[PDB]
Amino acid sequence: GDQRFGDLVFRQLAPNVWQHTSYLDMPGFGAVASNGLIVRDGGRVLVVDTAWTDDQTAQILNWIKQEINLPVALAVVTHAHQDKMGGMDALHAAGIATYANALSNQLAPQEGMVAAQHSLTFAANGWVEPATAPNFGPLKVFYPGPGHTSDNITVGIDGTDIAFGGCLIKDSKAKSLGNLGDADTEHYAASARAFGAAFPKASMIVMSHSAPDSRAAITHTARMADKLR
Ligand SMILES: Cc1c(CP(=O)(O)O)c2ccc(N3CCCC3)cc2n(CC2CCCC2)c1=O
Ligand SMILES: [Zn+2]
Ligand SMILES: [Zn+2]
């Protein structure tokens, strides 16, 4: 059930959850799909990840306006790369409170990203320090450890079977682990499984560059990561 809205695709995953998809024509490799989430929490909307660009991100807000018609209370972005943080200005222009890993906001300038307004910090166990993620409601935010990037974070939705690995997790039939230029070879496998252990009740794993999968994605990604050991 893919709904086309301008150059973006929206798919309902569950009663209060949609997957937003945006495309960037990358030279030689084609038009790359990137996924985030839109979660209705009672009388407000929560956004996970921007589109690639400000224009695309503004089309997510246009879609929310038409299809939900409630204020976007906050957005959380899963690491400091264009597919996840490219549209930060569009969120700020819309007056939306924005949250990222402290380290994402630290990296954002040199990555050519605009920093989120607010910084998340994580306890030893990797769960977000609740003080830093206020009014997140059903969004459960977890730092699995260094993987796809050193600053990558994951999000589960309470009252839902859905967990989001971002660019850390690839689908169960994936060939490679993709871009590893900013990756941590050592702890990737561990981080991939820490995400799995953090959301064990999650039967639908949403990820950046594939349609939603089974938990096989996590094991498959972790198993492919174990070759980097
Ligand atoms: C940041 C980044 C991404 C997004 P992410 O998956 O790393 O989050 C990317 C995402 C996808 C991608 N092709 C998709 C199929 C296989 C590879 C390449 C990506 N390249 C490398 C390009 C930079 C300019 C020319 C090559 C990236 O630099
Ligand atoms: Zn990335
Ligand atoms: Zn990615």
UniProtKB/Swiss-Prot annotation:
Cofactor requirements of the protein: Zn(2+)
Disulfide bond sites: none
Entry keyword set: Antibiotic resistance, Hydrolase, Metal-binding, Periplasm, Plasmid, Signal, Zinc
A molecular-function term among this protein's GO annotations: beta-lactamase activity
Enzyme class, broadest EC rank: hydrolase
Location of the protein in the cell: Periplasm
Residue positions binding Zn(2+) 1: H79, H81, H148
Description of how activity is regulated: Inhibits by captopril, thiorphan, dimercaprol and tiopronin. This enzyme is not susceptible to inactivation by the beta-lactamase-blocking agents clavulanic acid.
Co-factor binding details: Binds 2 Zn(2+) ions per subunit.
EC numbers, comma separated: 3.5.2.6
Subcellular location, principal: periplasm
Residues that hold substrate according to the record: K170, N179
Residues holding Zn(2+) 2: D83, C167, H209
GO cellular component: periplasmic space
Catalytic activity: a beta-lactam + H2O = a substituted beta-amino acid
GO BP terms in the entry: antibiotic catabolic process; response to antibiotic
Family indicated by similarity: Belongs to the metallo-beta-lactamase superfamily. Class-B beta-lactamase family.
Other remarks in the entry: Enterobacteriaceae carrying this gene (identified by PCR) have been isolated in Sweden, India, Pakistan, Bangladesh, England, Scotland, Northern Ireland, Australia and the USA. The organisms they were identified in were K.pneumoniae, Enterobacter cloacae, E.coli, Proteus spp, Citrobacter freundii, Morganella morganii, Providencia spp and Klebsille oxytoca. In India most isolates were from community-acquired infections rather than hospital-acquired infections, indicating the gene is widespread in the environment.
Oligomeric and partner information: Monomer.
Biological role: Confers resistance to the different beta-lactams antibiotics (penicillin, cephalosporin and carbapenem) via the hydrolysis of the beta-lactam ring. Does not confer resistance to the polymixin colistin or the fluoroquinolone ciprofloxacin.
Name the UniProt record assigns to this protein: Metallo-beta-lactamase type 2
Organism: Klebsiella pneumoniae
